[PDB]
């Protein structure tokens, strides 16, 4: 949108575009993944380009990288938000929300819930049947 934001995205496009032609190819994408210790085969390189390549020419140009980056940054916010919210519920930092933790946070939000009502709410969200809410079960409830 602003000139500074465009500048910063051009700098990120530039580490992927190794030869400076304005396009990122499966081989340039590959050179980047290899430098980060991952060595993909030409097949999953192709799947990665296909996701971002909107005109079908087999490469990625700057408009197409800009759309990807922008969409990816809205998604990464939605995650940051859901991780923060889970972490306020998991008072002891063990990865699981228990009935006591949820009840304690609900009373601080203004809602005094009995053990039967809190148990109903855990039972609804619990998929693996341990009577706790893990992160997966939490995001799945934050939609559904
Ligand atoms: Ca290139
Ligand atoms: Ca393209
Ligand atoms: Ca916990
Ligand atoms: Ca569970």
Swiss-Prot record:
Residues reported to bind Ca(2+) 1: 17, 19, 21, 23, 28
Pfam families: EF-hand_7
Keyword entries, A-Z: Acetylation, Calcium, Metal-binding, Methylation, Repeat
Modified residues (N6,N6,N6-trimethyllysine): 112
Binding residues annotated for Ca(2+) 4, in chain numbering: 126, 128, 130, 132, 137
UniProt keyword Cell cycle, yes or no: no
Record-listed N6,N6-dimethyllysine modification sites: 10
Gene3D superfamilies from the UniProt entry: EF-hand
Start and end residues of each EF-hand domain: 4-39, 40-75, 77-112, 113-144
Binding site for Ca(2+) 3: 90, 92, 94, 101
Keyword Transmembrane: no
Residues engaged in binding Ca(2+) 2: 53, 55, 57, 59, 64
The record's account of how the chain is modified after translation: The pantophobiac mutant CAM2 is undermethylated on Lys-112.
GO molecular function, one term: calcium ion binding
Listed result of changing residue 47 to N: In CAM12; lacks the Ca(2+)-dependent K(+) current
GO CC annotation, single: cytoplasm
Signal peptide start-end: none
Top-level lineage group: Eukaryota
Function in brief: Calmodulin mediates the control of a large number of enzymes, ion channels and other proteins by Ca(2+). Among the enzymes to be stimulated by the calmodulin-Ca(2+) complex are a number of protein kinases and phosphatases.
Recorded family membership: Belongs to the calmodulin family.
UniProt miscellaneous comment: This protein has four functional calcium-binding sites.
Protein name from the UniProt record: Calmodulin
């Amino acid at each position: 949108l602003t000139e500074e934001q465009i500048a910063e995205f051009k700098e990120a496009f530039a580490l992927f575009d190794k030869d400076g032609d304005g396009t990122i190819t499966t081989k340039e994408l590959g050179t980047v993944m290899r430098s980060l210790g991952q060595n993909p085969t030409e097949a999953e390189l192709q799947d990665m380009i296909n996701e971002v390549d909107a005109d079908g020419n087999g490469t990625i140009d700057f408009p197409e990288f800009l759309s990807l980056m922008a969409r990816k940054m809205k998604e990464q916010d939605s995650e940051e938000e859901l991780i923060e919210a889970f972490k306020v519920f998991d008072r002891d930092g063990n990865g699981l929300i228990s009935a006591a933790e949820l009840r304690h946070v609900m009373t601080n939000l203004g809602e005094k819930l009995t053990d039967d009502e809190v148990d109903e709410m855990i039972r609804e969200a619990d998929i693996d049947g341990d009577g706790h809410i893990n992160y997966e079960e939490f995001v799945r409830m934050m939609v559904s």
